[PDB]
Design a binder for these strands. Structure first.
Lengths: 122, 54, 119, 211, 117
RNA sequence: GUGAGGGGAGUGAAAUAGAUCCUGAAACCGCAUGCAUACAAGCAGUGGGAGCACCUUCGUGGUGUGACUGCGUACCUUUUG
RNA sequence: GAACCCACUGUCGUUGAAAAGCCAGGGGAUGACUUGUGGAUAGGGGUGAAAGGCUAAUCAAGCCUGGUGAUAGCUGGUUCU
RNA sequence: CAGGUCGAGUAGACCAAGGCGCUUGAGAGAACUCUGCUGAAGGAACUAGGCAAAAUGGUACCGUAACUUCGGGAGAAGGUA
RNA sequence: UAAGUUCCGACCUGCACGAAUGGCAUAAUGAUGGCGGCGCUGUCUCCAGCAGAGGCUCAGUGAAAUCGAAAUCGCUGUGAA
RNA sequence: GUACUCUGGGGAUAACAGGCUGAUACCGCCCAAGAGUUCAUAUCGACGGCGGUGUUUGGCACCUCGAUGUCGGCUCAUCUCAUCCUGGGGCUGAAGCAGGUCCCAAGGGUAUGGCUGUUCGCCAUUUAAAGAGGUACGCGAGCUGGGUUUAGAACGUCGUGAGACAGUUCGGUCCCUAUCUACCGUGGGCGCUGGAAAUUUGAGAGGAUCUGCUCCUAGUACGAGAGGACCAGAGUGGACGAACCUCUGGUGUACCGGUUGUGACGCCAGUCGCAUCGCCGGGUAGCUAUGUUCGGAAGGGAUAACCGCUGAAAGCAUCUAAGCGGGAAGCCUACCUCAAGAUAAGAUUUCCCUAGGACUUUAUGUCCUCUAAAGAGCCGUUCGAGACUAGGACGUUGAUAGGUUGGAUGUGGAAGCAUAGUGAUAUGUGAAGCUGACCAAUACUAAUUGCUCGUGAGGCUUGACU
């Protein structure tokens, strides 16, 4: 349940460490983004000498949330943090490592690489 | 907020046309035979042929 | 809304309400016939009758529960010595509530609360 | 169309083979009994009148007693009518019954009921009005209506203005529900989703009109 | 059994009859049926039971685990067919029904003493 | 209620002269009788006008009411108005 | 930092519990400090770490009584045919 | 003038001696208003303005920058039992 | 700052700074003015539940400002507009 | 000089809003030098001309000075069309994709932030789109009070001074319990051709009406390539709305436990009062969103611009004058809810009442005696119904409420007694004890004997059958 001004951890090694959501994309008056939704973010903290810098405006996809996702059998899965992965202008993943676990809501032609490089898919 | 015109006695009585009182439900008791309010103990302590104060 | 809710308020705090109902139960057990207002009388059943039910088995734990609820040693003794054996064979309905007109001071409806086998 | 009158029994879930959980509502059905058939010649329209349930003799009036005795069925707790056509009118006679076997699994139906009563309610709950600020100097106006009109032109309040008033306790129809189970031994319908009303309320089930 | 008899009768027809006995504070392994395409496989979820609700067909239990640095909790519906198997590995010893205080502890502080028969 | 207040009896020319008591107006508030009034829009009247009730010299009379209908935006002041 | 002396913010109150308050927070608290009793300064005067502040709920000149029925090219009102 | 248990204390919680339950009540448990408690995910996006709320808070020990009129800043910040 | 009519440093064609109606600075102090952070939160997205006091019903007591008179509807036009 | 101010007057006279007017403003049209490789008119269009609207800047001084009391924000709106999106078309300097221009169309929809008191504007990032206007520049007896415009103080400037401002800066009291109209809900009375219990038709009214992306047709038509469709299908979203509580959560001051201080119950043990529910951890029902499910689907009828068929006036031509068609998110239906006070008061099924006297005003006439029906209400136990009402269930031929018994749930190892320890404490008896609102049984307690209202066959005329 990510909205504007929410801070998120960065779950790859693109260089960014903390990002802030500034827009939820995909409709007029759209309120919230969940796992698998695209957001606009600004970079608040980054690794020195990286390809990304502080003050950059970028696209991202939400991978973990604290509010949680529902499953068809009635179950809910909740994580301890809110995390995102950075995308380029064409909305493709642009990182060479992923940190932590991931979900099945990214089984989509847009998002194979995160699953392929992720250590654990729970 | 207050009235701009004094209200006529006719309209005042028309408003009061709903203020009438109504009668209670009264019933003659069996064992003793005086009137009492229905479903209540009589003023002398009887109800349905039982006494409360001997 | 108050859909399916139980309990009363009677314009009192919760501690005041609980203490007042304990006082009413103690007075009822002492005198066996009291006069009160109708809502208080109807609510008094849910407080007083379980005490009589509990006093049917004379054990130390039951006596201590009765004391924790009433805080009156004379009431506990009466409950476990007189009233319990009296109602041993009766399945509930130890009280009787009868409407008794209205009160002069504020026209409040009133009622009598009496034990079933008083005399 | 021709339908059934039942009672709402409560909500539960059904698990499928794949593991999916389907929320369902249970409707208890006492087989409906036909009391009167209305025709074009006598009434000017075609409908079937049914009754269901039970009622004690001290509560059944003499007029209703004669009305039921003419049909030859026991007195129920309610009487209802279904508008029908000539094709549906085939096979129906006074004294016959209609059961749950009228429906089949997988069929789409509409369910009508009486919604729960919320009593006197204000703008926020009734019409989704927005509250004013809780701080920053606001005096005594948090959940109030606000403005209710313009000015000397037109100098009045229009009809249909949204204000405070009674909410709930209305007839409501939910369309497009799906039949999940037709239990004939227990005389029960199990339908996917929620239906209007509280447990114990009377509900009507009909074939869907959005066909 | 707080519901109507018909609802109880309809619910009772779907109950599982082979569940183990377990309590909050135990550590369990749950086998979850995963259907990718039409590949069927079983994924193991290992963790600590921190909450358990007993409501008949509506029974549930919550399992918390640390996976590669990030904590994760899953609420399982007990009678769902997607729950294939539950195995108890170690029985814990706690003082309460709900162990939500573990969410604020890490590692050294989050250990549960083993119950000894 | 050993109250307040009243009803008889009695005094007085008179008590509806009975004590904040000669006469006892109007605003205002009751009870009783007669007629009208719950499908119809506004300064409330005015010119017509059926019916009803009582009285009666029995009418081309009297008293009360006014279904229906034509016309009709208070008074004073100050103002070009 | 309590008593005591003040009066910075907010809600409430505004035909108030109150013709200046209550509640929650706030400042000084051995000093150019707070306070009781009794005295002194009187109206174009007094007093003022100075706001035209205060001088009995009244202050760019207090209150009371007299001149006095001040004057008003202004507003209102002005009674039977 | 002013006691007990803790307490640095005349602060504070509960009590003693001694005083009281504040001169309308009884029900109900709608909108809306006042005063409170809790709140998923987010955390100033509110607003003229973080207004109001939330937050910090004791004792002992360790440790503490620029700047300085060498007194301070300073309980700086921060940490332990 | 993603985005800064405010803020901070600098530039100097100062509409109309400037040296006891003092000029340029300055440690400490301020319920003083402006700007930015950490923590924290119902300020907000967007409100929900609960507790007390009113509101509402019954018995008792019993105000207020206002008021030419009222048998006191909409629309379009007219008309001291 | 007065912003420290005061009195008598004026809507005879200004600032706000209204009114008249329309110079100005905005929108439309006429002529057409020219521009557009030729070609005035695909698109622009000089020099000149004619109108419409009542948004701008103004003109006048008709209303209000015995008061019409606010620049923005908030909340809540309603209308126009000169249309921002979506829908239907003509032309094109229209290959396709796109665009330009004009015509029809008002059903629905139509951003969040940074700066500033701002309206406006600029900027960042979205969206199918972020339209233009009227409504006292809508809305302050609905909220605020940042700006302006009282009293304090300062700077620049002006004045000898009191003081002042095509200026700036810091601070600075927002009253009213709603009579009438209007509106949102909810009742009482009477009427509806004797009365009553139910079920109903529908004149009519209200609600709803939005839209993105992906796949398929098809890398096909088209195109030198780069690119790339019409029509016609499937799926999944955003915003909005409704109902619901099985699932996920919140709350849950009458449920369970841990623990601090103090007082008491004679004492230990065990408990209770007070401290925000003292604080802290959980949590049943109910309510609830952030949770779940569902909706705007499809189809008929008449049309708008526009496109026609046959066809003369006018031997040809021509959608029109006779005659016959197609055609839009728009209109009428269709979907949901209400609806006979629809005084035109409608329809169907069933049920109830059939007694005697006197009198004159000989009339659905008035007084006696005898009769109180079908039913409705008072009263009581109450509700997932509720301000009071109204509505639903039941009243001994009874499960309506409370209690009792059983179950379920929550919390979690009661008290007492035994063991092991110097002890704090731990283990056993035993998943025990306690458990508001839930499910099921059960007359133990309370729904008593009752009373009131509602009548006695329902005028006349004409017609068709009896």
């Amino acid at each position: 349940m990510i909205q504007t001004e929410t801070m998120l951890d960065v779950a790859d090694n693109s260089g960014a460490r903390r990002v802030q959501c500034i827009k939820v994309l995909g409709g007029s008056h759209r309120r919230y983004a969940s796992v698998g939704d695209i957001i606009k973010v600004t970079v608040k903290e980054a690794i020195p000498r990286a390809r990304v810098k502080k003050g950059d405006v970028m696209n991202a996809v939400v991978v973990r949330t604290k509010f949680g996702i529902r499953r068809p059998d009635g179950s809910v899965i909740r994580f301890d943090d809110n995390a995102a992965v950075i995308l380029n202008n064409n909305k493709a993943p642009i990182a060479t490592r992923i940190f932590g676990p991931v979900t099945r809501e990214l089984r989509t032609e847009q998002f194979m690489k995160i699953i392929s490089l992720a250590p654990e898919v729970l | 907020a207050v009235q701009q015109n004094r209200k006529s006695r006719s309209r005042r009585d028309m408003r009061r046309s709903h203020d009438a009182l109504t009668e209670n439900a009264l019933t003659v008791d069996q064992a003793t035979g005086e009137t009492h309010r229905r479903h209540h103990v009589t003023k002398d302590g009887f109800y349905r042929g039982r006494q409360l104060f001997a | 809304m108050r859909h399916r809710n139980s309990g009363v308020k009677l314009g009192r705090t919760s501690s005041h309400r609980k203490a007042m109902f304990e006082n009413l139960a103690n007075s009822l057990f002492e005198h066996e016939l009291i006069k009160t207002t109708l809502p208080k009388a109807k609510e008094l059943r849910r407080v007083a009758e379980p005490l009589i039910t509990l006093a049917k088995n004379d054990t130390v734990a039951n006596r201590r529960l009765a004391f924790a609820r009433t805080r009156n040693a004379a009431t506990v003794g009466k409950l476990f010595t007189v009233l319990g054996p009296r109602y041993k064979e009766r399945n509930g309905g130890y009280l009787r509530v009868l409407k008794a007109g209205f009160r002069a001071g504020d026209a409040a409806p009133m009622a009598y609360v009496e034990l079933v086998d008083r005399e | 169309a021709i339908g059934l009158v039942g009672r709402k029994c409560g909500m539960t879930r059904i698990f499928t083979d794949a593991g999916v959980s389907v929320p369902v509502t249970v409707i208890e059905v006492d087989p409906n009994r036909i009391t009167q058939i209305k025709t074009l010649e006598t009434d000017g329209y075609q409908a079937v009148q049914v009754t269901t349930g039970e009622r004690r003799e001290s509560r059944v009036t003499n007029a209703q007693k004669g009305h039921f005795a003419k049909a030859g069925v026991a007195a129920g707790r309610l009487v209802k009518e279904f508008r029908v056509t000539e094709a549906e009118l085939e096979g129906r006679e006074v004294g016959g019954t209609i059961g749950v076997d009228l429906f089949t699994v997988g069929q789409i139906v509409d369910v009508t009921g009486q919604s729960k009563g919320k009593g006197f309610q204000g703008g926020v709950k009734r019409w989704n009005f927005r509250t004013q600020d809780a701080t920053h100097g606001n005096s005594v106006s948090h959940r109030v209506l606000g403005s209710t009109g313009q000015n000397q032109t037109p100098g009045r309040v229009f009809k249909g203005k949204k204000m405070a008033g009674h909410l709930g306790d209305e007839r409501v129809t939910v369309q497009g529900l799906e039949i999940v189970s037709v239990d004939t031994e227990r005389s029960v319908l199990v339908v996917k989703g929620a239906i209007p009303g509280a447990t114990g309320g009377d509900v009507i089930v009909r074939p869907t009109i959005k066909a | 059994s707080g519901k109507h008899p018909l609802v109880q009768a309809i619910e009772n027809s779907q109950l599982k009859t082979d569940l183990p006995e377990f309590a909050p504070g135990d550590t369990v392994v749950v086998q979850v049926k995963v259907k990718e395409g039409d590949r069927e496989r079983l994924q193991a979820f290992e963790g600590v039971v921190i909450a358990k609700k007993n409501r008949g067909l509506n029974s549930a239990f919550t399992v918390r685990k640390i996976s590669s640095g990030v904590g994760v909790e899953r609420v399982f519906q007990t009678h769902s067919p997607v729950v294939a198997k539950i195995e108890v590995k170690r029985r814990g010893d706690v003082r309460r029904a709900k162990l939500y205080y573990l969410r604020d502890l890490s590692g050294k502080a989050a250990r549960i003493r083993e119950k000894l028969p």
